[PDB]
Amino acid sequence: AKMRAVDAAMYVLEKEGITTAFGVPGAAINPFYSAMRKHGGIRHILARHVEGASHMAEGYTRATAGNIGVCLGTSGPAGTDMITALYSASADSIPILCITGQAPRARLHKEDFQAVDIEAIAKPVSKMAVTVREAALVPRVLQQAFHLMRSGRPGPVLVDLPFDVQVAEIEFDPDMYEPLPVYKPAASRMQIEKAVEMLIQAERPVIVAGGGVINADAAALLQQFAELTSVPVIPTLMGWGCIPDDHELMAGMVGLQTAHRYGNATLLASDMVFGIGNRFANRHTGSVEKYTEGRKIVHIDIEPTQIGRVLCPDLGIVSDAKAALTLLVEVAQEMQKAGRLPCRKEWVADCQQRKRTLLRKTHFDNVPVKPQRVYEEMNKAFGRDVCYVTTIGLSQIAAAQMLHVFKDRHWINCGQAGPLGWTIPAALGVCAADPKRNVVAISGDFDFQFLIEELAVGAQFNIPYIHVLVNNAYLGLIRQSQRAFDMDYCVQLAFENINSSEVNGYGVDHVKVAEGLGCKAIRVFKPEDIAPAFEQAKALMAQYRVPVVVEVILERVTNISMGSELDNVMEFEDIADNAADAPTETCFMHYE
Amino acid sequence: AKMRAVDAAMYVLEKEGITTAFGVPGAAINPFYSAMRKHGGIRHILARHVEGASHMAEGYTRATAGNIGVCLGTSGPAGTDMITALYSASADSIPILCITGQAPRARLHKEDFQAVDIEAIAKPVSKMAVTVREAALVPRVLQQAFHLMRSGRPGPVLVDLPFDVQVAEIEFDPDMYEPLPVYKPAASRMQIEKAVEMLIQAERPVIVAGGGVINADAAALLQQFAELTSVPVIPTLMGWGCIPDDHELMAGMVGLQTAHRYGNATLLASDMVFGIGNRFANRHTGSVEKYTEGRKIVHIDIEPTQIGRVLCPDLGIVSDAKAALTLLVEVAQEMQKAGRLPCRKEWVADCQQRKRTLLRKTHFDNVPVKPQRVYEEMNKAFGRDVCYVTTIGLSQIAAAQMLHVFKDRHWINCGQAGPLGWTIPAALGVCAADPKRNVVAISGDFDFQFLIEELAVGAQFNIPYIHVLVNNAYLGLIRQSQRAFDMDYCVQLAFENINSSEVNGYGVDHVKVAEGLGCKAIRVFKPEDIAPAFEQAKALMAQYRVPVVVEVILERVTNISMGSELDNVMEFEDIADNAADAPTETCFMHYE
Amino acid sequence: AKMRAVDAAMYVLEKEGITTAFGVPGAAINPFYSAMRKHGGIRHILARHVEGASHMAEGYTRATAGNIGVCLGTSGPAGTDMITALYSASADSIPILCITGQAPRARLHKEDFQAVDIEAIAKPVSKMAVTVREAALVPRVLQQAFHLMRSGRPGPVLVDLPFDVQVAEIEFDPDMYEPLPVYKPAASRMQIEKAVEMLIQAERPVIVAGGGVINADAAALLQQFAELTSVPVIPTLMGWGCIPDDHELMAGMVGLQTAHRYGNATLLASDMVFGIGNRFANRHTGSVEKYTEGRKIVHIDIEPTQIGRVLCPDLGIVSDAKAALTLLVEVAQEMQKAGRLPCRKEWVADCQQRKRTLLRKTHFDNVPVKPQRVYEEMNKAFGRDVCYVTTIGLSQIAAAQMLHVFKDRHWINCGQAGPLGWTIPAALGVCAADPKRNVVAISGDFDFQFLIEELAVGAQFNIPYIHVLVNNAYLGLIRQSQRAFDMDYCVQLAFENINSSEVNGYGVDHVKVAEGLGCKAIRVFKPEDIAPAFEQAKALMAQYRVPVVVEVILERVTNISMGSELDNVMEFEDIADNAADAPTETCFMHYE
Numbered sequence A, B, C: 001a002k003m004r005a006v007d008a009a010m011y012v013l014e015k016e017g018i019t020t021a022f023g024v025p026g027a028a029i030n031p032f033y034s035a036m037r038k039h040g041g042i043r044h045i046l047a048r049h050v051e052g053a054s055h056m057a058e059g060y061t062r063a064t065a066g067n068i069g070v071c072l073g074t075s076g077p078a079g080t081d082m083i084t085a086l087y088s089a090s091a092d093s094i095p096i097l098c099i100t101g102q103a104p105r106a107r108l109h110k111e112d113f114q115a116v117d118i119e120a121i122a123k124p125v126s127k128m129a130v131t132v133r134e135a136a137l138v139p140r141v142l143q144q145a146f147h148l149m150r151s152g153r154p155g156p157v158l159v160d161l162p163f164d165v166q167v168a169e170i171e172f173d174p175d176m177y178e179p180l181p182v183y184k185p186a187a188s189r190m191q192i193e194k195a196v197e198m199l200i201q202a203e204r205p206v207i208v209a210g211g212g213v214i215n216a217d218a219a220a221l222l223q224q225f226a227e228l229t230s231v232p233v234i235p236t237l238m239g240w241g242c243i244p245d246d247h248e249l250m251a252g253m254v255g256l257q258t259a260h261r262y263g264n265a266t267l268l269a270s271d272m273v274f275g276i277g278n279r280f281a282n283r284h285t286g287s288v289e290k291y292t293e294g295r296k297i298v299h300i301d302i303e304p305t306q307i308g309r310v311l312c313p314d315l316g317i318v319s320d321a322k323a324a325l326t327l328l329v330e331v332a333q334e335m336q337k338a339g340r341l342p343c344r345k346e347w348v349a350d351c352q353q354r355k356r357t358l359l360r361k362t363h364f365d366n367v368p369v370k371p372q373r374v375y376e377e378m379n380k381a382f383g384r385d386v387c388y389v390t391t392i393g394l395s396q397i398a399a400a401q402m403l404h405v406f407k408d409r410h411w412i413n414c415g416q417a418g419p420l421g422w423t424i425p426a427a428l429g430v431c432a433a434d435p436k437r438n439v440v441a442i443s444g445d446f447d448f449q450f451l452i453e454e455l456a457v458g459a460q461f462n463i464p465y466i467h468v469l470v471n472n473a474y475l476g477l478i479r480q481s482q483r484a485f486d487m488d489y490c491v492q493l494a495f496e497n498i499n500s501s502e503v504n505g506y507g508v509d510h511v512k513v514a515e516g517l518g519c520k521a522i523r524v525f526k527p528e529d530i531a532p533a534f535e536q537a538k539a540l541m542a543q544y545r546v547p548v549v550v551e552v553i554l555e556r557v558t559n560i561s562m563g564s565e566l567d568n569v570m571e572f573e574d575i576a577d578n579a580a581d582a583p584t585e586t587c588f589m590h591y592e
């Protein structure tokens, strides 16, 4: 039972579910790596940037309900390269576990090489950030970390391990180690009865299903509750997938950018928002006064201080989403056995009528290619079990408003922080979490470049997925936002590549870069070549077992639909009211 | 005089010396970019990672004495991508100015999209980190920022600008704006007299010249003081260059890794260390007890709290290095006019005797190439005005112990934090600071990959320099440190590149990657091909005006000399006692 | 259901158990006071110092198991006067709820009158410190606060309320409000079985019962477990009372100051410490190496990061003390039904032998009075249900080593922080928590003076108790500690009072001060007058219903027993081995 602190840490991590770790080793964290090798049972992926390792951990977590991605680094700048991910994870209410090396305790206040107060730096963007001050506390801090990462509003933790703390001997009985119970508040029968009593008197209600539903692993129950009450569902961007897109009750998405015309119109026509596992995000609502006008609000959240933060709800209930939905289904079934649930045939109908006339054109034959044609071809090329990974840009905004998803955790997106560079490592993290997952990523050229070297991780370790790269040689979104300032300034990436005429002054040759990094890559200039390229990509993945990049050369400037209010979203590109122009809407097409 | 806050900020920046800015735009920082374009006078370089923009700013600062590099970003994750650089700059006592966008004040505590408390996160690693709460304070916070960045111990500042603060109208008269006076403490005649009185009774004194000398722009005065007293000089890694390497009094460098055998032996033989503008860094001293044994210590620093932090000096004086050296020269000249400065012929002589027998072998004809042969060829190929840029690894340790530098700020190195990825952007920052500078960077393969995409910045904007890439398909330094743990684990980068046989399973094809990013690249397998490659590189730079990468394929495993104490440094590779094996030592060779 | 945020706060506070509040009003907190008056159901006590209000809350909490003392103040310096109490409460793992007023949100960063960042200041010494940013969050922050104050390791919370947030209208249904579930970890059968299996093979075991037992409301179960196993009990200072002092298994207290000679000897003779609800406090253990020598350690704590913080235990279990003791009793009962619990007659016997021979003399007839005679008279004068309140000094050290307590929460003492001035307000808070409690406080002259004005609270509101004041005109404890530095410097309070000869140059006339503040007071010069004085005090309380101070004039210098190690405690005053000298030891005297 006598043992190094880091050796005890391996028992804890194992009993606590960890089988994978992403990281970059260093002298200050070598004892940890030594204990991991001696113990076995954890697969280590070596990243080619610490930020990459961080975002891989995020993807690993977000892929499957019980998963906790682990990120490993040395002292000093390794810890400062993980702050963006801790922020991203905090912001979206999901956990990662960061572990950093550190100089010995005696030397923390002498300016020891690569010694920084990572504890103070990480505090504002984690549920806990702590420097472990005793060897015997190493297993206990991890014990406490897993409690915090699963309980209440989930979030990330950073553990900082001084060299001398790691290597010191402790007494530890791993047979005696017990994971702590997970804390979750639960709604009462009375509260839920009031909520359903309120729902039934609404003439035109909608359910807004947030990422909390997914966090609680409660997608089936949400769908069941909507079905029993016959109430249309609007998923948030983070709730996207918790009811399938081809379901009769899914009424679209709402907001300023990643939303549908029918979604916004249905919300503006509704007389109630039944919010479950959502907060009321800035870009979902616009001006709160407008979002709430003539409309009752119910809000169910696991976190007390998220209720009333942005708007004051008519009801507001503190509860885990699974517990609350279990009651909601039970209470709905009792209302149904009495004659107390109203028929909602008409309201459901005209929600669907909006859904098949208020569309956006995707079927463009133009050369150079219009980006909205790319998302049409993706819907056709990939099956219903597809899992999309993306970050930020005109690339992901248009993707969000034109792609379709049919299960929970088949849209992996850092919705609140959106750090460029996220997409590649996040994708790799999902693949490591589930080798059966049909992972497909979307990026613009700038996002693709930030952490482009992480493709070589996918090559070294054989982690295959498909990366769709839509290239306009622009910071697209920013160029569009600069219209209000009457300029086009510091947003172009184009230049004449002295080694590559083929790219026609678009600058970076992503095909050569991808191939040099050990991957496969295909470039597409014409819209009809997109479908064949995706089939080529699937074949290359199967034999070579590496990431395959499909680059599409876009027209330089395309303005994607968006606005500052729900009733104010601007359509720059062609709208559509029939299937010929928008053939991959779920109402017009059966998904594999 | 009525004007936007950001428009007033441009006047301040201009009057305060700024002509260059590195950044990545976004919606939250667009008003700033708008004011910059309207005003003119600042050259913007678009980076391809915010971290890249940050490290470019660091290089820009470090290149020339009055320079302040500026780093521009949006809200949220842009700010969290700059923390590593703020740390790096703080750690080495040098300033950068970071400016980030931010959500409006009314919405800072609602979870507004990409809104983070960057103020709290950046606090521990900057002299000031502040969110500007009023429009009229925008010019005043910048005014205060430049005072802090130049005064006392220099360090970096972060300014966080809420959207509504940027665009609000203020009254501002730019003709009335006055930069604040720079605060610097100065030594007294009495203190310096005591220091020189102490120096003259020392039998075997050495001067340890730190990065403070360079910070104060006092290299000429340091050399003059050493010459007048006839006292050998040991530069710290950060002081390297403040006396030329071929000077008769430069006795080498001291420490655990980036040091010379003769340097360590001279220090261990000395009876006094006269520390000017140094702190006594962990990897310079080893165990303080050993560094100080039988030896008197004088310590001159600008910062009171740096004196006595690691060891207690016999004297210790608070002063700017230029002011102190001006007195030291004056007092030395008075001692010389009397008969009071001792002759030090013998001590100087046997310092030089060590310097020409305690060497390390560089002239290896092996294939695959030994890294120490690369540094030999660099010394031959490049002129005396060469400016080296590097970060961390066996690549930079061996570079530090075998390359030679002949002027101050011709060794640009992040000595305390050493964040991987630093080298490329830092190099580009130096080039932007001085288009006449003969900039040459050294990286290992892992460092090169972290922020590899920033090469495309060098291509888009035409910023030429030479990047020497020493490739062993390894995390070299870490592999070496793992010897003590009896392992070789998670430190290899090698794989069979399915697109490139030429690289022989070394993994990433840096030539293809570099060319795809718009640059030129040459690969070298044999030692005799290195000299021609460097001449080819100089030609390519002149016509194409882009970064040129010279990749050298190294043998996989080479153990570089290092240890945990000055008397304990281990020589794994062949030592040398004559010029045939080490032909580029300054005593054996005249530098252009 | 439309209502001010402060009105909703009253519903929350009431449903959450609050019936009492201590405070000092101000303009910034007037809306709260207004809502409190309108709602009814909370008794407000006006303090005469905010610090007084804070410590009253602490006493109120500590008095009875479910109690949460509430402290109310204005903005600015009211909040900074509560930091000492937040620290004290945190330090001893007990909650108080502080509520402060604050300037409007729009003006928090303009230097608005009495506006301070209390959130930042209070963060390091509370489980939560928050400025409420929205009206609708007021009830939710309080909801979250009560969860934190009851769950895990209990601690204090500070809620900071901007004026405009208090007065704003919100929608709130109080019938729908549900207090959150309390989180507590619980031990498993397996873990407890291992602990009992370990205890059984110990030859000379001791149970150390800490303040966690009292916190968990598990005194009866602890006694029962000790009885079933026949294992002697050592309470910590904070665990004191959880087994009665006259119990046959209570073996005394251990430590450097508030300890018994028999307690220390028993512990040094033991071969195991079974720690339940204790941490291993600095002044309980001395050097950890000496405390653990030849001894096994079991440690049961509710907080993971308290286990291994000071020493590494042989077992260590994370659990609430009530849940753990329920299992321990169950498992003990099963061991007893088998023949598996050993007989411990001999070990119990010689623990009791120590307890009746290793004593300290208390029966002194000296004039001026020796302080140890005071505690003897207190034991005689007061019943078994007596409840002592004290803080720090030779006054409380000697009290702790000579008084006796017979139930849990009949020793109210701020053991980790010990802030001077605590005693008076703490006592008043206990009395407000329970008007049937026979409260008796002990102070030295300096402790008594810090917050002497709070006696007038006891007079204005009719809150009676007895305050024993032992007066030596000295900072006694500090004088004693200064012996090692060979001095007596800045520790005397004596002067010739120009209004009072009767005090003989002892300085402050506490009788005149107490009477002026509206209370009654008696002064005693001779030991035989102490008993009658206590009887007089009881009579005055009954009739006048106010605090009654009994001042005893001590000899100026008395050195109380203490040391830096358990085997190193020094006896300056006479020891004793018989009842004649120490007549109030529980084995010589029946209590009530």
Ligand SMILES: Cc1cc2nc3c(=O)[nH]c(=O)nc-3n(C[C@H](O)[C@H](O)[C@H](O)COP(=O)(O)OP(=O)(O)OC[C@H]3O[C@@H](n4cnc5c(N)ncnc54)[C@H](O)[C@@H]3O)c2cc1C
Pocket: A091, A092, A093, A152, A153, A154, A209, A210, A211, A212, A213, A215, A216, A236, A237, A238, A239, A254, A255, A256, A257, A258, A259, A277, A278, A279, A280, A281, A282, A283, A284, A300, A301, A302, A303, A306, A319, A320, A321, A322, A391, A392, A393, A397, A414, A415, A416, A418, B113
């Ligand atoms: C360029 C860009 C444009 C965007 N445009 C839009 C847009 O138009 N419309 C839009 O909606 N979004 C958009 N987004 C995303 C948006 O910013 C938010 O990330 C998203 O709306 C928030 O989702 P949510 O409300 O479900 O909250 P989440 O971040 O998913 O979290 C909501 C709540 O879940 C709670 N919770 C956690 N666990 C549980 C549990 N187990 N049980 C119950 N509750 C739990 C948390 O307390 C939290 O308050 C955009 C993002 C970007 C990158």
Ligand SMILES: Cc1cc2nc3c(=O)[nH]c(=O)nc-3n(C[C@H](O)[C@H](O)[C@H](O)COP(=O)(O)OP(=O)(O)OC[C@H]3O[C@@H](n4cnc5c(N)ncnc54)[C@H](O)[C@@H]3O)c2cc1C
Pocket: A113, B091, B092, B093, B152, B153, B154, B209, B210, B211, B212, B213, B215, B216, B236, B237, B238, B239, B254, B255, B256, B257, B258, B259, B277, B278, B279, B280, B281, B282, B283, B284, B300, B301, B302, B303, B306, B319, B320, B321, B322, B391, B392, B393, B397, B414, B415, B416, B418
């Ligand atoms: C892998 C690796 C190995 C290394 N090995 C070694 C090694 O073997 N030996 C070695 O020496 N270094 C080594 N270094 C670098 C080392 O860690 C430190 O960065 C370096 O020694 C510190 O330099 P310095 O003492 O001059 O202090 P600096 O960081 O340069 O600063 C010293 C002082 O200058 C003062 N100062 C600032 N401005 C002024 C002013 N105007 N006037 C006067 N004073 C001022 C500051 O207050 C500060 O205390 C290594 C680095 C790495 C990456």
Ligand SMILES: Cc1cc2nc3c(=O)[nH]c(=O)nc-3n(C[C@H](O)[C@H](O)[C@H](O)COP(=O)(O)OP(=O)(O)OC[C@H]3O[C@@H](n4cnc5c(N)ncnc54)[C@H](O)[C@@H]3O)c2cc1C
Pocket: C091, C092, C093, C152, C153, C154, C209, C210, C211, C212, C213, C215, C216, C236, C237, C238, C239, C254, C255, C256, C257, C258, C259, C277, C278, C279, C280, C281, C282, C283, C284, C285, C300, C301, C302, C303, C306, C319, C320, C321, C322, C391, C392, C393, C397, C414, C415, C416, C418
């Ligand atoms: C002048 C002076 C001298 C002193 N001398 C001594 C001395 O001689 N000897 C001595 O022992 N003390 C002495 N004290 C007090 C001492 O400093 C500590 O306050 C005391 O030792 C702590 O007791 P404890 O171990 O029970 O810790 P506590 O402060 O009571 O807390 C212990 C543990 O309880 C846990 N806990 C909280 N709730 C629960 C729960 N529901 N279930 C399970 N665990 C829970 C916490 O996590 C914590 O780790 C002295 C104080 C002063 C003022």
Ligand SMILES: Cc1ncc(C[n+]2csc(CCOP(=O)(O)OP(=O)(O)O)c2C)c(N)n1
Pocket: A392, A393, A394, A395, A396, A418, A419, A420, A443, A444, A445, A446, A447, A448, A472, A474, A475, A476, A477, A478, B024, B025, B026, B027, B050, B074, B077, B078, B081
């Ligand atoms: C670290 C960071 N810096 C800046 C931004 C602002 N960001 C938003 S989208 C965007 C442009 C991305 O362009 P690209 O990835 O090429 O996709 P496009 O919009 O052109 O489709 C930028 C710069 C960000 N989200 N993160």
Ligand SMILES: Cc1ncc(C[n+]2csc(CCOP(=O)(O)OP(=O)(O)O)c2C)c(N)n1
Pocket: A024, A025, A026, A027, A050, A074, A077, A078, A081, B392, B393, B394, B395, B396, B418, B419, B420, B443, B444, B445, B446, B447, B448, B472, B474, B475, B476, B477, B478
């Ligand atoms: C962000 C970060 N992570 C990890 C480290 C530890 N780091 C020290 S040198 C090194 C290996 C670098 O190898 P390479 O750049 O290929 O050069 P080599 O040592 O092989 O010459 C590592 C991983 C660091 N300095 N910074």
Ligand SMILES: Cc1ncc(C[n+]2csc(CCOP(=O)(O)OP(=O)(O)O)c2C)c(N)n1
Pocket: C392, C393, C394, C395, C396, C418, C419, C420, C443, C444, C445, C446, C447, C448, C472, C474, C475, C476, C477, C478
């Ligand atoms: C705010 C504060 N300041 C200083 C101390 C140190 N304190 C320890 S006991 C003590 C002396 C108290 O003397 P008194 O209350 O007269 O009791 P005596 O020691 O004479 O019995 C002091 C000054 C403290 N606990 N708190």
Ligand SMILES: [Mg+2]
Pocket: A049, A449, A450, A451, A452, A453, B049, B449, B450, B451, B452, B453
């Ligand atoms: Mg990169």
Ligand SMILES: [Mg+2]
Pocket: A444, A445, A446, A470, A471, A472, A473, A474, A475, A476
């Ligand atoms: Mg683009």
Ligand SMILES: [Mg+2]
Pocket: B444, B445, B446, B470, B471, B472, B473, B474, B475, B476
């Ligand atoms: Mg390498």
Ligand SMILES: [Mg+2]
Pocket: C049, C449, C450, C451, C452, C453
């Ligand atoms: Mg007072």
Ligand SMILES: [Mg+2]
Pocket: C444, C445, C446, C470, C471, C472, C473, C474, C475, C476
């Ligand atoms: Mg006293």
